[PDB]
Write a protein that binds this ligand. Structure first.
Ligand SMILES: CCCCCCCCO[C@@H]1O[C@H](CO)[C@@H](O)[C@H](O)[C@H]1O
Ligand SMILES: CCCCCCCCO[C@@H]1O[C@H](CO)[C@@H](O)[C@H](O)[C@H]1O
Ligand SMILES: CCCCCCCCO[C@@H]1O[C@H](CO)[C@@H](O)[C@H](O)[C@H]1O
Ligand SMILES: CCCCCCCCO[C@@H]1O[C@H](CO)[C@@H](O)[C@H](O)[C@H]1O
Ligand SMILES: CCCCCCCCO[C@H]1O[C@H](CO)[C@@H](O)[C@H](O)[C@H]1O
Ligand SMILES: *[P@@](=O)(CCCCCCCCCCC)OC
Ligand SMILES: [Ca+2]
Lengths: 85, 449
């Protein structure tokens, strides 16, 4: 909390705090820590407004392809896979 | 002064045991009864419940101990007990790859006291283990070459005491961050050294001076093969802030231990992973660790690199010389395994300022993008860098180049990689080519050439 430039595995409240811009947690009721962004061909999440992810956004030049829904946005579940273009 | 015990012999406070710069105090070890060394057996037959055995035919006989397979003893250090999860956690991983008699040596009766007294208590424990080994030899004709003793901290020296008494006939000892105070710089009689076992391999993870740095382990080289992962002084993932160390993914207890001595405990954490990752810990022979990170000790030499950890005994030249230093980097969290590569990118396109990244694609998968260089990106210039990948990609089929910079030029430049050469740790080279160029933040896919 109130501490910027955090490392992976360090607890966080929001992605702004993480060097890798992804504060992540696997479930709703569980602590979130800084995690690396999704590499190509693995699971990701569409950039969000909630600050944290259940899956991280992709690395540079990569697109997280998957179904993007209105429900998926409010629920932070706009999942997909990292693809080149 | 001399105090003698049945079974174990005498113990004296003569030099060098006491009365020297490193060990001034004249301390004698506690009684065998007090130290209360216990042998807790685990096997493939009994992986979750320990059968407490002892150096007596009825014990070995009534129990699951099989005389036709290796035996590995695990001795803890100061404050710990043989029932600590990390110990049994090692046997359980061993059960994943071999049939074995896993023996956890508990001596909390002597480890949960003043350190100077724990350091002396170490000799009763060594004595207890050599007694048990000689017993297995005499009683069952079991060879001490089938014996492997693993010892963490103080236990590394207790393992060395147990080897002294068996005249270096035990197969091997693995010192997991041998304690420094009261042992570094002293004579071999008093500590682990290559002569205690047929082969001695050591993992160094907390070698900073005890004062003022408080590094619990030694920097001094004490075996045949001495490994210094991450340089052997500061381990990645250790310097997290207080709240994060304590509230880490493994529960409070693990977190708390790590708050207290993360680097030090990394040695057994590394060893446990190597067991199930036989090629994940290639150590590189090198003058020092700075020369290693300076990209001057790659790839593995002819004949190979020794694997740090469990598979270090598979190394052909393990006893060719003593104190051979190897370097390597690991991960900052479980599955500490890393595979080192080297990539040489020759630039094309426009001279710009930025960071260049590369990701590898092979039969077994692909990796993260790794920064190869950052600064002035001038055409036809080549830049190399070695890095530790969290995945083994196998045979390379493709490499994707990519660059970017915090300041976007109003001209919209295009930078390319005319050639990228990937070299694996065993010396295999793959070449990739491209005539194309790309805007920043667009992957340039290079194909085999
Ligand atoms: C419900 C379970 C998920 C909660 C969030 C899990 C965050 C785990 O996170 C991981 O922790 C390690 C050390 O703690 C770091 O090395 C990893 O890089 C980090 O991402
Ligand atoms: C005394 C602490 C109260 C304020 C702490 C707020 C943030 C605590 O941590 C939060 O816990 C939640 C459930 O464990 C997770 O969903 C959050 O992602 C996690 O960061
Ligand atoms: C050494 C004096 C205090 C010992 C620590 C007591 C509290 C932590 O104790 C630990 O609790 C954990 C959960 O049961 C277990 O994993 C450990 O085996 C147990 O010792
Ligand atoms: C996909 C596989 C993720 C494995 C992440 C590691 C899970 C927990 O295992 C390990 O336990 C130790 C306890 O102190 C820590 O030091 C390690 O770094 C931690 O990662
Ligand atoms: C093992 C019994 C003695 C423990 C002494 C603990 C003294 C403080 O030391 C510890 O805390 C420091 C900060 O958290 C860490 O940086 C060190 O790596 C660790 O040794
Ligand atoms: P190893 O058995 C002990 C390594 C050296 C520790 C000495 C420190 C104890 C004195 C108090 C200072 C913190 O650890 C498991
Ligand atoms: Ca010795």
């Amino acid at each position: 909390g109130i501490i910027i430039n955090l490392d992976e595995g360090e607890l966080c409240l929001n992605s702004a705090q993480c060097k890798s811009n992804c504060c992540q947690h696997d479930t709703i009721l569980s602590l979130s820590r800084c995690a690396l962004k999704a590499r190509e061909n693995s699971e990701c999440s569409a950039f969000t407004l909630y600050g944290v992810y259940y899956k991280c956004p992709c690395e540079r030049g990569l697109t997280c392809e998957g179904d993007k829904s209105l429900v998926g946005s409010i629920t932070n579940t706009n999942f997909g896979i990292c693809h080149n273009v | 002064k001399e105090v003698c015990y049945e079974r174990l012999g005498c113990f004296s406070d003569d030099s060098p045991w006491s009365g020297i710069t490193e060990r001034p105090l004249h301390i004698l070890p506690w009684s065998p009864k007090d130290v209360n060394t216990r042998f807790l057996l685990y096997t493939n037959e009994n992986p979750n419940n320990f059968q407490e055995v002892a150096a007596d035919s009825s014990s070995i006989s009534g129990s699951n101990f099989k005389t036709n397979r290796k035996t590995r003893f695990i001795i803890h250090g100061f404050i710990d007990k043989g029932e600590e999860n990390w110990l049994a956690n090692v046997c359980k991983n061993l059960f994943k790859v071999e049939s074995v008699n896993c023996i956890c040596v508990d001596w909390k009766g002597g480890s949960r006291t003043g350190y100077t007294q724990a350091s002396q208590n170490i000799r009763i424990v060594g004595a207890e283990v050599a007694y048990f080994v000689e017993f297995l030899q005499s009683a069952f004709g079991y060879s001490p070459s089938n014996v492997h003793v693993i010892g963490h901290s103080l236990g590394a020296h207790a393992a060395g005491e147990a080897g002294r008494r068996t005249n270096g006939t035990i197969g091997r000892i693995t010192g997991l961050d041998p304690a420094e105070p009261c042992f570094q710089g002293t004579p071999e009689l008093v500590r682990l050294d290559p002569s205690d076992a047929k082969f001695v391999d050591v993992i160094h993870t907390d070698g900073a001076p005890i004062v003022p740095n408080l590094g619990f382990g030694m920097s001094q080289v004490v075996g045949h093969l001495d490994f210094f992962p991450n340089g052997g002084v500061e381990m990645p993932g250790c310097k997290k802030n207080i709240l994060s160390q304590i509230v880490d993914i493994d529960g409070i207890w693990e977190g708390t231990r790590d708050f207290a001595a993360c680097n030090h405990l990394r040695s057994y954490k590394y060893y446990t992973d190597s067991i199930v990752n036989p090629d994940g810990f290639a150590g590189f022979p090198c003058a020092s660790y700075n020369v290693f990170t300076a990209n001057k000790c790659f790839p593995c030499p002819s004949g190979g690199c020794p694997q740090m950890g469990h598979y270090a005994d598979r190394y052909p030249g393990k006893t060719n010389d003593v104190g051979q230093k190897f370097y390597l980097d690991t991960g900052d969290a479980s599955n500490f395994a890393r595979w080192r590569y080297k990539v040489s990118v020759t630039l094309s396109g426009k001279k710009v300022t930025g960071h260049i990244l590369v990701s590898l694609f092979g039969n077994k998968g692909n990796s993260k993008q790794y920064e190869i260089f950052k600064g002035t990106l001038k055409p036809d210039s080549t830049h190399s860098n070695e890095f530790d990948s969290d995945v083994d990609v196998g045979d390379l089929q493709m490499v994707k180049f990519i660059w970017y910079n915090n300041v976007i030029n109003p001209t919209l430049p295009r930078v390319g990689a005319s050639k990228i050469i990937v070299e694996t740790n065993v010396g295999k080279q793959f070449n990739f080519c491209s005539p194309e160029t790309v805007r920043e933040e667009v992957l340039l896919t290079l194909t085999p050439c």
